[PDB]
Protein backbone atom coordinates (compact mmCIF):
# COMPACT_ATOMS: atom_id res chain seq x y z
CA UNK A 1 0.00 0.00 0.00
CA UNK A 2 0.88 3.40 -0.90
CA UNK A 3 -0.25 6.51 1.08
CA UNK A 4 0.97 9.83 -0.63
CA UNK A 5 0.17 12.36 1.66
CA UNK A 6 0.64 16.13 1.74
CA UNK A 7 -0.86 18.97 4.22
CA UNK A 8 -3.64 16.74 5.21
CA UNK A 9 -4.48 15.21 2.30
CA UNK A 10 -3.48 12.19 0.01
CA UNK A 11 -3.20 10.79 -3.40
CA UNK A 12 -6.37 8.96 -4.35
CA UNK A 13 -5.92 8.19 -8.09
CA UNK A 14 -9.79 7.70 -8.98
CA UNK A 15 -10.66 7.79 -5.16
CA UNK A 16 -8.88 4.59 -4.30
CA UNK A 17 -6.20 4.25 -2.36
CA UNK A 18 -2.86 3.00 -4.08
CA UNK A 19 -1.79 -0.44 -4.45
CA UNK A 20 0.54 -2.32 -6.59
CA UNK A 21 3.90 -0.95 -6.70
CA UNK A 22 5.98 1.77 -7.21
CA UNK A 23 6.82 1.49 -10.77
CA UNK A 24 3.32 2.47 -11.54
CA UNK A 25 2.71 5.25 -9.08
CA UNK A 26 5.91 6.80 -9.92
CA UNK A 27 7.81 6.19 -6.83
CA UNK A 28 10.91 4.77 -8.41
CA UNK A 29 13.64 6.95 -6.26
CA UNK A 30 11.05 8.52 -3.88
CA UNK A 31 11.61 8.21 -0.29
CA UNK A 32 9.39 6.15 1.75
CA UNK A 33 8.33 5.00 5.36
CA UNK A 34 6.69 1.64 6.27
CA UNK A 35 4.37 2.81 8.26
CA UNK A 36 2.26 -0.54 8.81
CA UNK A 37 1.11 -3.92 7.57
CA UNK A 38 -2.63 -4.87 6.66
CA UNK A 39 -3.64 -8.72 4.69
CA UNK A 40 -0.42 -9.21 5.68
CA UNK A 41 1.71 -6.21 3.11
CA UNK A 42 3.50 -3.34 3.92
CA UNK A 43 1.92 -0.06 4.04
CA UNK A 44 4.21 2.60 3.05
CA UNK A 45 4.19 6.52 3.47
CA UNK A 46 5.69 8.92 0.97
CA UNK A 47 6.00 13.02 1.95
CA UNK A 48 5.53 14.15 -1.71
CA UNK A 49 2.36 16.11 -3.17
CA UNK A 50 0.92 15.71 -6.51
CA UNK A 51 -0.47 17.87 -9.18
CA UNK A 52 -3.59 15.87 -9.36
CA UNK A 53 -5.82 13.42 -7.44
CA UNK A 54 -4.59 14.65 -3.22
CA UNK A 55 -7.50 13.86 -1.48
CA UNK A 56 -9.02 14.23 2.59
CA UNK A 57 -8.79 11.59 4.84
CA UNK A 58 -12.83 11.74 4.86
CA UNK A 59 -12.63 10.31 0.73
CA UNK A 60 -11.14 6.75 2.13
CA UNK A 61 -13.17 6.50 5.10
CA UNK A 62 -15.71 3.46 3.75
CA UNK A 63 -12.78 0.91 3.17
CA UNK A 64 -11.53 -1.69 5.92
CA UNK A 65 -11.21 0.42 9.35
CA UNK A 66 -7.54 -1.48 10.06
CA UNK A 67 -6.76 0.07 6.31
CA UNK A 68 -8.29 3.68 7.78
CA UNK A 69 -6.52 3.62 10.71
CA UNK A 70 -3.19 3.16 8.38
CA UNK A 71 -3.97 5.27 5.88
CA UNK A 72 -4.60 8.85 8.38
CA UNK A 73 -1.95 7.18 10.41
CA UNK A 74 0.12 7.80 7.58
CA UNK A 75 -1.56 11.43 7.06
CA UNK A 76 -0.91 12.48 10.48
CA UNK A 77 2.36 10.97 10.84
CA UNK A 78 3.35 13.10 7.57
CA UNK A 79 1.41 16.55 8.73
CA UNK A 80 3.26 15.70 12.26
CA UNK A 81 6.91 16.05 10.22
CA UNK A 82 5.40 18.64 8.49
CA UNK A 83 3.92 20.58 11.50
CA UNK A 84 8.16 20.37 13.30
CA UNK A 85 9.89 21.65 10.64
CA UNK A 86 11.11 24.22 12.92
CA UNK A 87 11.58 23.93 16.67
CA UNK A 88 9.08 25.81 18.55
CA UNK A 89 11.31 26.37 21.45
CA UNK A 90 14.91 27.94 19.76
CA UNK A 91 13.11 28.29 15.94
CA UNK A 92 16.17 26.03 14.68
CA UNK A 93 15.22 23.34 11.87
CA UNK A 94 14.83 20.04 13.04
CA UNK A 95 14.96 16.54 11.52
CA UNK A 96 13.06 13.05 12.55
CA UNK A 97 14.46 10.32 14.69
CA UNK A 98 15.90 7.22 12.99
CA UNK A 99 14.78 5.40 15.91
CA UNK A 100 11.04 6.62 16.75
CA UNK A 101 8.73 8.46 15.15
CA UNK A 102 9.44 12.32 16.92
CA UNK A 103 11.42 14.79 15.85
CA UNK A 104 15.01 16.08 17.15
CA UNK A 105 15.79 19.48 17.25
CA UNK A 106 19.42 20.48 15.38
CA UNK A 107 20.31 23.35 17.95
CA UNK A 108 18.34 21.97 21.60
CA UNK A 109 18.09 19.02 23.38
CA UNK A 110 13.69 19.35 23.14
CA UNK A 111 12.20 17.19 21.08
CA UNK A 112 8.47 16.39 19.81
CA UNK A 113 6.37 13.29 19.74
CA UNK A 114 3.18 12.55 17.76
CA UNK A 115 -0.16 13.97 19.59
CA UNK A 116 -3.03 12.49 20.55
CA UNK A 117 -5.71 14.72 20.83
CA UNK A 118 -8.20 13.14 23.53
CA UNK A 119 -11.51 14.22 23.17
CA UNK A 120 -15.42 13.30 24.68
CA UNK A 121 -19.05 12.49 23.09
CA UNK A 122 -21.47 12.05 24.91
CA UNK A 123 -25.68 11.28 24.53
CA UNK A 124 -28.16 13.65 26.94
CA UNK A 125 -30.73 11.69 27.69
CA UNK A 126 -34.31 14.22 29.24
CA UNK A 127 -36.89 10.94 30.66
CA UNK A 128 -38.64 9.58 27.03
CA UNK A 129 -36.00 11.88 25.02
CA UNK A 130 -32.56 12.28 24.11
CA UNK A 131 -30.92 15.47 22.72
CA UNK A 132 -30.03 15.29 19.15
CA UNK A 133 -28.11 18.16 17.19
CA UNK A 134 -26.83 19.04 13.88
CA UNK A 135 -23.32 21.02 13.34
CA UNK A 136 -22.93 23.85 11.36
CA UNK A 137 -19.68 23.03 9.97
CA UNK A 138 -20.95 18.95 9.03
CA UNK A 139 -24.55 20.63 7.62
CA UNK A 140 -25.04 16.99 6.42
CA UNK A 141 -29.07 16.67 7.79
CA UNK A 142 -28.05 14.18 10.05
CA UNK A 143 -29.01 14.54 13.95
CA UNK A 144 -26.15 13.40 15.98
CA UNK A 145 -24.56 13.92 19.71
CA UNK A 146 -22.48 16.54 21.20
CA UNK A 147 -18.89 16.29 21.16
CA UNK A 148 -15.78 18.23 22.25
CA UNK A 149 -12.15 18.09 22.21
CA UNK A 150 -10.33 18.01 26.44
CA UNK A 151 -8.55 21.34 27.63
CA UNK A 152 -5.15 21.18 29.78
CA UNK A 153 -6.46 20.98 33.68
CA UNK A 154 -9.88 19.24 32.57
CA UNK A 155 -11.00 15.79 33.73
CA UNK A 156 -13.20 13.90 30.93
CA UNK A 157 -16.48 14.29 32.87
CA UNK A 158 -15.52 18.10 33.25
CA UNK A 159 -15.16 18.07 29.45
CA UNK A 160 -18.36 16.86 29.09
CA UNK A 161 -20.17 19.07 31.28
CA UNK A 162 -18.50 22.18 29.74
CA UNK A 163 -18.54 21.26 26.13
CA UNK A 164 -22.61 20.67 26.97
CA UNK A 165 -23.26 24.28 28.42
CA UNK A 166 -20.52 26.30 25.58
CA UNK A 167 -23.24 24.07 22.82
CA UNK A 168 -26.35 23.97 24.11
CA UNK A 169 -26.23 25.59 27.68
CA UNK A 170 -27.80 22.78 29.63
CA UNK A 171 -26.27 20.72 32.65
CA UNK A 172 -26.05 17.04 32.88
CA UNK A 173 -25.84 14.80 35.59
CA UNK A 174 -25.27 10.85 36.27
CA UNK A 175 -22.47 10.60 33.43
CA UNK A 176 -21.72 6.82 32.29
CA UNK A 177 -18.55 5.76 30.14
CA UNK A 178 -19.82 3.49 27.39
CA UNK A 179 -16.33 2.84 25.33
CA UNK A 180 -13.66 4.39 23.84
CA UNK A 181 -12.46 4.50 19.80
CA UNK A 182 -8.76 6.09 18.06
CA UNK A 183 -9.63 8.33 15.16
CA UNK A 184 -6.47 8.57 12.92
CA UNK A 185 -6.55 11.41 10.56
CA UNK A 186 -6.66 14.49 13.74
CA UNK A 187 -4.92 12.11 15.78
CA UNK A 188 -7.18 11.67 18.70
CA UNK A 189 -8.59 8.94 21.68
CA UNK A 190 -12.54 9.77 21.74
CA UNK A 191 -14.37 8.85 25.18
CA UNK A 192 -17.97 8.07 25.10
CA UNK A 193 -20.47 8.85 28.17
CA UNK A 194 -24.41 8.89 28.36
CA UNK A 195 -25.38 11.53 30.64
CA UNK A 196 -28.64 12.73 31.93
CA UNK A 197 -30.55 16.22 31.67
CA UNK A 198 -30.61 17.78 35.22
CA UNK A 199 -31.63 21.77 34.82
CA UNK A 200 -31.57 24.38 31.40
CA UNK A 201 -32.91 25.07 28.12
CA UNK A 202 -31.57 24.58 24.81
CA UNK A 203 -29.34 27.31 24.04
CA UNK A 204 -27.04 26.83 21.02
CA UNK A 205 -24.16 28.88 19.72
CA UNK A 206 -24.42 29.20 16.10
CA UNK A 207 -20.68 28.89 15.02
CA UNK A 208 -20.77 25.39 16.51
CA UNK A 209 -24.75 23.89 16.15
CA UNK A 210 -27.02 24.62 13.49
CA UNK A 211 -29.81 23.51 15.41
CA UNK A 212 -30.72 20.88 18.40
CA UNK A 213 -34.14 19.36 20.26
CA UNK A 214 -35.42 16.62 22.34
CA UNK A 215 -36.25 13.65 19.81
CA UNK A 216 -38.52 11.19 21.91
CA UNK A 217 -37.59 7.01 21.44
CA UNK A 218 -40.51 6.54 19.26
CA UNK A 219 -39.65 9.75 16.66
CA UNK A 220 -36.20 9.36 15.91
CA UNK A 221 -34.48 11.83 13.12
CA UNK A 222 -32.15 10.95 10.53
CA UNK A 223 -29.02 9.54 12.57
CA UNK A 224 -25.49 8.43 12.17
CA UNK A 225 -25.07 4.96 10.79
CA UNK A 226 -24.72 1.38 12.83
CA UNK A 227 -21.18 0.95 13.80
CA UNK A 228 -20.51 4.68 14.93
CA UNK A 229 -20.08 5.28 18.53
CA UNK A 230 -22.37 8.25 18.23
CA UNK A 231 -24.94 5.99 16.92
CA UNK A 232 -24.35 3.27 20.03
CA UNK A 233 -24.99 6.03 22.16
CA UNK A 234 -28.14 6.91 20.58
CA UNK A 235 -29.31 3.17 20.70
CA UNK A 236 -28.56 2.59 24.34
CA UNK A 237 -30.00 5.90 25.27
CA UNK A 238 -33.06 4.79 23.17
CA UNK A 239 -33.49 1.34 24.43
CA UNK A 240 -33.60 2.83 28.06
CA UNK A 241 -36.07 5.45 27.30
CA UNK A 242 -38.21 2.99 25.63
CA UNK A 243 -37.88 0.42 28.42
CA UNK A 244 -38.69 3.30 31.00
CA UNK B 1 -7.98 37.45 30.88
CA UNK B 2 -4.65 38.47 29.39
CA UNK B 3 -3.23 41.53 31.05
CA UNK B 4 -0.38 43.54 33.07
CA UNK B 5 -0.97 42.95 36.54
CA UNK B 6 -1.81 46.09 37.97
CA UNK B 7 -1.21 47.30 42.21
CA UNK B 8 -4.72 46.15 42.87
CA UNK B 9 -4.92 42.65 41.39
CA UNK B 10 -5.15 39.55 44.26
CA UNK B 11 -5.39 36.03 44.16
CA UNK B 12 -3.93 32.30 43.47
CA UNK B 13 -0.38 33.01 41.54
CA UNK B 14 1.22 30.15 39.77
CA UNK B 15 4.85 31.72 38.61
CA UNK B 16 6.10 28.45 36.77
CA UNK B 17 8.76 27.79 34.45
CA UNK B 18 10.61 24.74 32.85
CA UNK B 19 7.96 22.03 34.74
CA UNK B 20 8.46 23.99 37.85
CA UNK B 21 6.55 26.39 39.92
CA UNK B 22 7.40 29.22 42.61
CA UNK B 23 6.35 27.45 46.25
CA UNK B 24 7.59 29.78 48.84
CA UNK B 25 7.70 27.63 51.91
CA UNK B 26 6.26 24.87 50.02
CA UNK B 27 3.01 26.71 49.34
CA UNK B 28 1.09 27.84 46.66
CA UNK B 29 1.14 31.49 46.67
CA UNK B 30 -1.96 33.81 47.67
CA UNK B 31 -3.04 37.05 48.37
CA UNK B 32 -1.50 40.35 46.65
CA UNK B 33 0.36 41.24 43.49
CA UNK B 34 2.13 43.56 45.65
CA UNK B 35 3.56 41.60 48.44
CA UNK B 36 5.01 39.00 45.34
CA UNK B 37 6.65 41.44 43.69
CA UNK B 38 4.30 40.82 40.60
CA UNK B 39 3.31 44.32 40.12
CA UNK B 40 3.59 45.40 36.16
CA UNK B 41 4.15 41.31 35.00
CA UNK B 42 2.36 39.49 32.11
CA UNK B 43 -0.13 37.05 33.45
CA UNK B 44 -2.94 34.97 32.44
CA UNK B 45 -6.31 33.73 34.22
CA UNK B 46 -6.10 30.16 34.07
CA UNK B 47 -9.31 29.59 36.27
CA UNK B 48 -10.86 30.87 39.75
CA UNK B 49 -10.97 29.15 42.93
CA UNK B 50 -13.95 29.66 45.16
CA UNK B 51 -14.21 33.31 43.64
CA UNK B 52 -10.59 34.36 43.54
CA UNK B 53 -8.71 34.52 40.10
CA UNK B 54 -5.72 31.66 39.78
CA UNK B 55 -3.16 33.60 37.20
CA UNK B 56 -0.44 32.03 35.12
CA UNK B 57 2.92 34.17 35.58
CA UNK B 58 5.68 32.55 33.42
CA UNK B 59 8.58 33.43 35.46
CA UNK B 60 11.40 31.88 36.87
CA UNK B 61 12.70 32.87 40.42
CA UNK B 62 16.06 32.04 41.94
CA UNK B 63 14.81 29.96 44.28
CA UNK B 64 11.86 27.40 45.76
CA UNK B 65 11.39 26.60 42.36
CA UNK B 66 9.82 22.95 42.68
CA UNK B 67 7.18 20.27 41.23
CA UNK B 68 3.69 20.59 41.70
CA UNK B 69 3.63 17.24 43.68
CA UNK B 70 4.78 19.07 46.40
CA UNK B 71 1.01 20.99 47.00
CA UNK B 72 -1.03 17.83 46.50
CA UNK B 73 -2.50 18.50 49.48
CA UNK B 74 -4.27 21.26 48.51
CA UNK B 75 -8.14 20.60 47.26
CA UNK B 76 -8.57 18.68 43.91
CA UNK B 77 -9.96 21.45 42.16
CA UNK B 78 -7.61 23.89 42.92
CA UNK B 79 -4.84 21.49 42.58
CA UNK B 80 -6.35 20.66 38.71
CA UNK B 81 -5.73 24.53 38.10
CA UNK B 82 -2.07 24.49 39.72
CA UNK B 83 -1.51 21.67 37.43
CA UNK B 84 -3.08 23.49 34.32
CA UNK B 85 -0.68 26.43 34.79
CA UNK B 86 2.24 24.53 34.75
CA UNK B 87 1.06 22.58 31.70
CA UNK B 88 -0.09 25.93 30.55
CA UNK B 89 3.54 27.45 30.63
CA UNK B 90 5.49 24.21 29.06
CA UNK B 91 3.04 24.24 26.55
CA UNK B 92 3.23 28.36 25.40
CA UNK B 93 7.63 27.40 26.00
CA UNK B 94 7.36 24.88 23.31
CA UNK B 95 5.67 27.10 20.70
CA UNK B 96 6.95 30.59 20.34
CA UNK B 97 8.17 29.66 16.94
CA UNK B 98 5.63 28.04 14.56
CA UNK B 99 6.75 24.69 13.48
CA UNK B 100 5.35 24.76 10.15
CA UNK B 101 7.10 28.06 9.02
CA UNK B 102 9.39 29.38 12.12
CA UNK B 103 7.54 32.78 12.72
CA UNK B 104 7.19 33.65 16.26
CA UNK B 105 3.84 32.85 17.47
CA UNK B 106 1.01 34.85 19.60
CA UNK B 107 -0.67 33.13 22.38
CA UNK B 108 -5.03 33.42 21.31
CA UNK B 109 -7.10 35.16 23.95
CA UNK B 110 -10.50 32.84 23.05
CA UNK B 111 -9.06 29.69 23.58
CA UNK B 112 -5.40 27.95 25.23
CA UNK B 113 -4.00 27.47 21.55
CA UNK B 114 -0.95 29.38 19.89
CA UNK B 115 -1.73 31.26 16.78
CA UNK B 116 1.29 31.92 13.85
CA UNK B 117 1.77 35.53 12.77
CA UNK B 118 2.55 34.50 9.53
CA UNK B 119 0.73 30.80 8.32
CA UNK B 120 -2.64 29.75 8.80
CA UNK B 121 -1.28 27.06 11.26
CA UNK B 122 -2.02 26.57 14.64
CA UNK B 123 -1.30 24.56 18.01
CA UNK B 124 -3.36 22.95 21.03
CA UNK B 125 -1.77 21.93 24.15
CA UNK B 126 -0.35 18.41 24.20
CA UNK B 127 -2.37 16.26 26.13
CA UNK B 128 -1.13 12.13 26.73
CA UNK B 129 -3.63 9.83 27.79
CA UNK B 130 -2.90 7.01 30.41
CA UNK B 131 -4.54 4.10 31.75
CA UNK B 132 -4.72 3.29 35.36
CA UNK B 133 -6.47 0.74 36.26
CA UNK B 134 -6.49 -1.30 40.18
CA UNK B 135 -6.71 -5.15 39.87
CA UNK B 136 -8.80 -7.33 42.29
CA UNK B 137 -7.97 -11.49 43.24
CA UNK B 138 -11.10 -11.62 45.68
CA UNK B 139 -10.76 -10.14 49.06
CA UNK B 140 -7.17 -8.80 47.35
CA UNK B 141 -5.61 -5.99 45.33
CA UNK B 142 -2.46 -6.19 43.33
CA UNK B 143 0.20 -3.22 44.51
CA UNK B 144 3.22 -2.94 42.89
CA UNK B 145 6.50 -1.08 44.21
CA UNK B 146 8.69 0.93 41.44
CA UNK B 147 12.46 0.44 41.06
CA UNK B 148 12.61 4.12 39.22
CA UNK B 149 11.49 5.32 43.20
CA UNK B 150 12.41 3.13 45.70
CA UNK B 151 9.88 5.87 48.16
CA UNK B 152 8.32 1.97 49.79
CA UNK B 153 4.73 3.54 48.88
CA UNK B 154 2.69 0.43 46.61
CA UNK B 155 0.55 1.50 43.86
CA UNK B 156 -1.48 0.29 40.75
CA UNK B 157 -0.61 -0.25 37.42
CA UNK B 158 -0.41 2.39 34.52
CA UNK B 159 0.65 2.96 31.06
CA UNK B 160 0.92 5.80 28.00
CA UNK B 161 -2.04 4.59 25.50
CA UNK B 162 -0.60 3.99 22.42
CA UNK B 163 -1.45 4.86 18.70
CA UNK B 164 -4.44 3.29 17.09
CA UNK B 165 -5.33 1.83 20.76
CA UNK B 166 -8.71 2.19 22.44
CA UNK B 167 -8.55 2.44 26.36
CA UNK B 168 -9.78 -1.34 26.95
CA UNK B 169 -6.72 -2.34 24.60
CA UNK B 170 -4.39 -0.32 26.75
CA UNK B 171 -5.64 -1.59 30.22
CA UNK B 172 -5.05 -4.94 28.93
CA UNK B 173 -1.58 -4.35 27.09
CA UNK B 174 0.04 -2.53 30.34
CA UNK B 175 -1.46 -5.36 32.47
CA UNK B 176 0.42 -8.13 30.65
CA UNK B 177 3.31 -6.18 29.52
CA UNK B 178 3.69 -4.71 33.52
CA UNK B 179 2.46 -7.88 35.66
CA UNK B 180 1.83 -11.20 32.87
CA UNK B 181 -1.89 -11.34 34.13
CA UNK B 182 -5.22 -11.09 32.24
CA UNK B 183 -8.36 -9.29 33.76
CA UNK B 184 -11.57 -9.41 33.41
CA UNK B 185 -15.07 -7.29 34.38
CA UNK B 186 -13.13 -3.67 33.32
CA UNK B 187 -14.87 -1.16 34.46
CA UNK B 188 -14.17 2.78 33.91
CA UNK B 189 -14.18 4.96 37.30
CA UNK B 190 -12.90 8.69 36.94
CA UNK B 191 -10.02 10.40 34.88
CA UNK B 192 -7.23 12.89 36.01
CA UNK B 193 -5.57 15.30 34.76
CA UNK B 194 -1.56 14.23 35.93
CA UNK B 195 0.70 17.46 34.86
CA UNK B 196 3.54 14.88 35.36
CA UNK B 197 4.63 15.94 32.32
CA UNK B 198 0.92 16.39 30.67
CA UNK B 199 -1.00 13.24 31.00
CA UNK B 200 -4.35 12.35 31.24
CA UNK B 201 -5.26 9.58 33.66
CA UNK B 202 -8.14 7.27 32.85
CA UNK B 203 -9.03 4.98 35.70
CA UNK B 204 -10.39 1.28 35.66
CA UNK B 205 -11.08 -0.87 38.17
CA UNK B 206 -10.66 -4.65 37.15
CA UNK B 207 -10.64 -8.39 38.45
CA UNK B 208 -8.02 -11.30 37.92
CA UNK B 209 -9.30 -13.50 35.46
CA UNK B 210 -5.96 -15.32 34.38
CA UNK B 211 -2.03 -15.64 34.37
CA UNK B 212 0.72 -15.47 36.55
CA UNK B 213 2.78 -12.52 38.07
CA UNK B 214 5.87 -12.14 35.49
CA UNK B 215 7.53 -8.50 36.07
CA UNK B 216 10.21 -6.56 35.00
CA UNK B 217 13.42 -6.02 37.20
CA UNK B 218 14.27 -3.26 35.99
CA UNK B 219 10.53 -1.26 36.00
CA UNK B 220 8.56 -3.19 39.08
CA UNK B 221 10.81 -4.69 42.04
CA UNK B 222 8.10 -6.59 43.61
CA UNK B 223 4.13 -7.27 42.95
CA UNK B 224 2.16 -8.63 45.65
CA UNK B 225 -1.58 -9.33 46.28
CA UNK B 226 -2.47 -7.09 49.55
CA UNK B 227 -5.58 -7.78 51.83
CA UNK B 228 -8.31 -4.97 51.42
CA UNK B 229 -7.97 -4.57 54.99
CA UNK B 230 -4.05 -4.65 55.69
CA UNK B 231 -2.71 -2.58 53.06
CA UNK B 232 1.00 -1.21 52.77
CA UNK B 233 2.29 2.52 52.32
CA UNK B 234 0.28 3.62 49.42
CA UNK B 235 0.01 7.00 47.02
CA UNK B 236 -1.08 10.40 49.43
CA UNK B 237 -5.08 11.44 48.83
CA UNK B 238 -5.43 13.39 45.70
CA UNK B 239 -4.32 10.58 43.58
CA UNK B 240 -6.42 9.30 41.54
CA UNK B 241 -4.32 5.99 42.48
CA UNK B 242 -5.66 6.07 45.74
CA UNK B 243 -9.11 6.98 45.10
CA UNK B 244 -8.89 3.57 42.63
CA UNK B 245 -7.64 1.67 46.02
CA UNK B 246 -9.93 2.99 48.39
CA UNK B 247 -12.90 2.54 46.14
CA UNK B 248 -11.69 -1.19 45.41
CA UNK B 249 -11.34 -1.64 49.44
CA UNK B 250 -15.10 -0.08 49.90
CA UNK B 251 -16.27 -2.87 47.42
CA UNK B 252 -14.73 -5.66 49.53
CA UNK B 253 -16.49 -3.92 52.72
CA UNK B 254 -19.19 -4.10 51.17
CA UNK B 255 -19.58 -7.58 49.57
CA UNK B 256 -17.70 -9.17 53.03
ZN1 LIG C 1 15.35 23.75 19.50
ZN1 LIG D 1 3.65 29.60 10.78
Redesign the interface.
Known amino acids: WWVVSHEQKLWLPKGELPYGEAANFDLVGQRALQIGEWQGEPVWLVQQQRRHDMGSVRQVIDLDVGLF ?1 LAG ?1 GVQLAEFY ?10 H ?1 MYPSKTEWAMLCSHCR ?1 R ?7 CIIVAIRRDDSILLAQHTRHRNGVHTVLAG ?9 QAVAREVMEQSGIKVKNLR ?1 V ?4 W ?1 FP ?1 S ?1 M ?1 AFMAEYDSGDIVIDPKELLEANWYRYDDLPLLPPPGTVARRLIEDTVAMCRAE
Do not use: N
Open positions: QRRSHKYCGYCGEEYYPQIAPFVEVGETLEYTSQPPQLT
